[PDB]
């Protein structure tokens, strides 16, 4: 099919035990991504792609988040987490105020071809780096409701 699904969280830089970033593998179940701790200032989570393919459109739901960046890369080599290419810079969906109880505390957004670099999006990748950014928590953890990709 002309879609892209996740397999497992290859790399991660912000995930808890029960609500770990691996919960993103089950976008339709009963668990989402939640930073390993509270004080959601900036969390990173690199997920793997069940198959190396290109990227034409992406889907990510914000769970009290505000900025969401996504990088692309392949499992080739795998020396450091800096051998990726900025597929789509951080996307601002919410703010650090409505995430509490002033406005939409949760919203889901997506990306297409215009939001992805053509020089890289058309390159077959099989790894993705998702990094959320925005200081909205302090005692309770949070992050994304789910993450998806589609060619």
Short mmCIF file of C-alpha atoms in Angstrom, two decimals:
data_model
loop_
_atom_site.label_atom_id
_atom_site.label_comp_id
_atom_site.label_asym_id
_atom_site.label_seq_id
_atom_site.Cartn_x
_atom_site.Cartn_y
_atom_site.Cartn_z
CA UNK A 1 0.00 0.00 0.00
CA UNK A 2 1.03 3.70 -0.41
CA UNK A 3 1.47 4.27 3.36
CA UNK A 4 4.18 4.01 6.04
CA UNK A 5 3.89 2.37 9.48
CA UNK A 6 6.29 2.33 12.46
CA UNK A 7 7.99 -0.83 13.79
CA UNK A 8 9.77 0.15 17.02
CA UNK A 9 11.40 3.17 18.71
CA UNK A 10 14.98 2.82 17.32
CA UNK A 11 16.39 5.78 19.32
CA UNK A 12 14.77 7.83 22.12
CA UNK A 13 15.61 10.97 24.13
CA UNK A 14 12.52 11.39 26.43
CA UNK A 15 10.19 8.46 27.30
CA UNK A 16 8.73 6.94 30.50
CA UNK A 17 8.20 3.25 31.40
CA UNK A 18 4.41 2.75 31.22
CA UNK A 19 3.77 5.67 28.83
CA UNK A 20 6.94 5.15 26.75
CA UNK A 21 7.52 6.42 23.19
CA UNK A 22 6.98 2.81 22.02
CA UNK A 23 3.25 3.43 22.71
CA UNK A 24 3.32 5.39 19.43
CA UNK A 25 3.56 2.00 17.68
CA UNK A 26 -0.10 1.59 18.78
CA UNK A 27 -1.61 4.89 17.53
CA UNK A 28 -5.01 3.19 18.04
CA UNK A 29 -5.07 1.52 21.49
CA UNK A 30 -4.95 3.48 24.80
CA UNK A 31 -1.48 5.03 25.31
CA UNK A 32 0.57 7.86 23.73
CA UNK A 33 4.09 9.34 24.11
CA UNK A 34 5.00 10.86 27.48
CA UNK A 35 8.42 12.29 28.49
CA UNK A 36 10.34 10.10 30.96
CA UNK A 37 9.74 12.91 33.49
CA UNK A 38 7.69 16.11 33.85
CA UNK A 39 8.75 19.69 33.00
CA UNK A 40 8.22 19.01 29.28
CA UNK A 41 10.83 21.46 27.98
CA UNK A 42 12.15 19.47 24.99
CA UNK A 43 11.75 15.72 24.30
CA UNK A 44 13.24 13.64 21.46
CA UNK A 45 12.11 10.23 20.15
CA UNK A 46 13.60 8.57 17.04
CA UNK A 47 11.22 5.93 15.66
CA UNK A 48 12.10 3.28 13.04
CA UNK A 49 10.14 2.64 9.83
CA UNK A 50 8.95 -0.94 9.14
CA UNK A 51 10.33 -0.39 5.57
CA UNK A 52 12.78 2.04 3.92
CA UNK A 53 10.68 4.30 1.71
CA UNK A 54 10.32 8.00 0.82
CA UNK A 55 7.97 10.44 2.60
CA UNK A 56 5.26 12.54 0.90
CA UNK A 57 2.94 13.18 3.87
CA UNK A 58 3.26 12.70 7.64
CA UNK A 59 0.81 12.64 10.59
CA UNK A 60 1.49 13.52 14.27
CA UNK A 61 -0.98 14.42 17.04
CA UNK A 62 0.01 17.01 19.66
CA UNK A 63 -0.54 15.95 23.31
CA UNK A 64 -0.06 19.26 25.16
CA UNK A 65 2.90 19.91 22.80
CA UNK A 66 3.62 23.03 20.74
CA UNK A 67 6.69 22.54 18.50
CA UNK A 68 7.23 19.24 16.62
CA UNK A 69 10.33 18.68 14.44
CA UNK A 70 10.96 15.56 12.32
CA UNK A 71 14.27 14.47 10.74
CA UNK A 72 14.83 11.60 8.28
CA UNK A 73 17.60 9.01 7.91
CA UNK A 74 18.34 5.37 7.17
CA UNK A 75 19.56 2.50 9.33
CA UNK A 76 22.72 2.52 7.13
CA UNK A 77 25.88 2.76 9.30
CA UNK A 78 24.19 4.11 12.46
CA UNK A 79 27.17 5.84 14.12
CA UNK A 80 25.49 8.89 15.69
CA UNK A 81 22.06 10.58 15.72
CA UNK A 82 23.33 13.50 13.58
CA UNK A 83 23.43 11.69 10.19
CA UNK A 84 19.82 12.66 9.38
CA UNK A 85 18.39 15.50 7.30
CA UNK A 86 15.77 18.01 8.48
CA UNK A 87 12.74 16.59 6.60
CA UNK A 88 10.40 19.10 8.29
CA UNK A 89 11.53 21.74 10.84
CA UNK A 90 9.66 22.05 14.16
CA UNK A 91 5.97 22.77 13.54
CA UNK A 92 4.16 25.13 15.94
CA UNK A 93 0.63 23.80 16.63
CA UNK A 94 -0.20 24.89 20.20
CA UNK A 95 1.30 27.26 22.79
CA UNK A 96 2.53 26.97 26.45
CA UNK A 97 -0.80 28.41 27.75
CA UNK A 98 -3.69 26.61 25.99
CA UNK A 99 -1.92 23.29 26.75
CA UNK A 100 -3.02 23.79 30.39
CA UNK A 101 -6.72 24.83 30.45
CA UNK A 102 -7.04 28.14 28.55
CA UNK A 103 -7.66 26.82 25.03
CA UNK A 104 -7.20 23.55 23.06
CA UNK A 105 -5.19 21.36 25.53
CA UNK A 106 -4.76 18.73 22.79
CA UNK A 107 -4.83 18.89 18.96
CA UNK A 108 -3.54 16.69 16.11
CA UNK A 109 -1.83 17.98 12.94
CA UNK A 110 -0.17 16.50 9.85
CA UNK A 111 2.41 17.36 7.17
CA UNK A 112 2.56 16.92 3.38
CA UNK A 113 5.14 17.43 0.55
CA UNK A 114 5.41 21.22 1.05
CA UNK A 115 6.32 20.59 4.71
CA UNK A 116 9.08 18.11 3.72
CA UNK A 117 12.38 18.81 1.94
CA UNK A 118 12.18 17.41 -1.62
CA UNK A 119 15.95 16.74 -1.79
CA UNK A 120 15.48 14.38 1.20
CA UNK A 121 11.73 13.47 1.35
CA UNK A 122 12.10 11.75 -2.07
CA UNK A 123 15.05 9.74 -0.68
CA UNK A 124 14.17 6.30 0.74
CA UNK A 125 14.67 6.54 4.53
CA UNK A 126 13.79 3.99 7.26
CA UNK A 127 14.42 5.99 10.48
CA UNK A 128 12.85 9.23 11.75
CA UNK A 129 13.77 11.61 14.60
CA UNK A 130 10.76 13.27 16.29
CA UNK A 131 11.64 16.08 18.73
CA UNK A 132 8.87 18.03 20.51
CA UNK A 133 9.68 21.49 21.95
CA UNK A 134 7.77 23.86 24.36
CA UNK A 135 7.81 24.30 28.21
CA UNK A 136 4.20 23.44 29.20
CA UNK A 137 4.52 20.90 32.05
CA UNK A 138 6.43 20.73 35.36
CA UNK A 139 4.93 18.01 37.59
CA UNK A 140 3.13 15.77 35.10
CA UNK A 141 4.74 14.41 31.85
CA UNK A 142 3.23 14.69 28.34
CA UNK A 143 4.28 14.89 24.65
CA UNK A 144 2.50 13.48 21.58
CA UNK A 145 -0.79 11.56 21.24
CA UNK A 146 0.54 9.46 18.33
CA UNK A 147 2.88 9.57 15.31
CA UNK A 148 2.36 8.25 11.76
CA UNK A 149 3.95 8.53 8.28
CA UNK A 150 2.67 7.96 4.70
CA UNK A 151 4.36 7.99 1.27
#
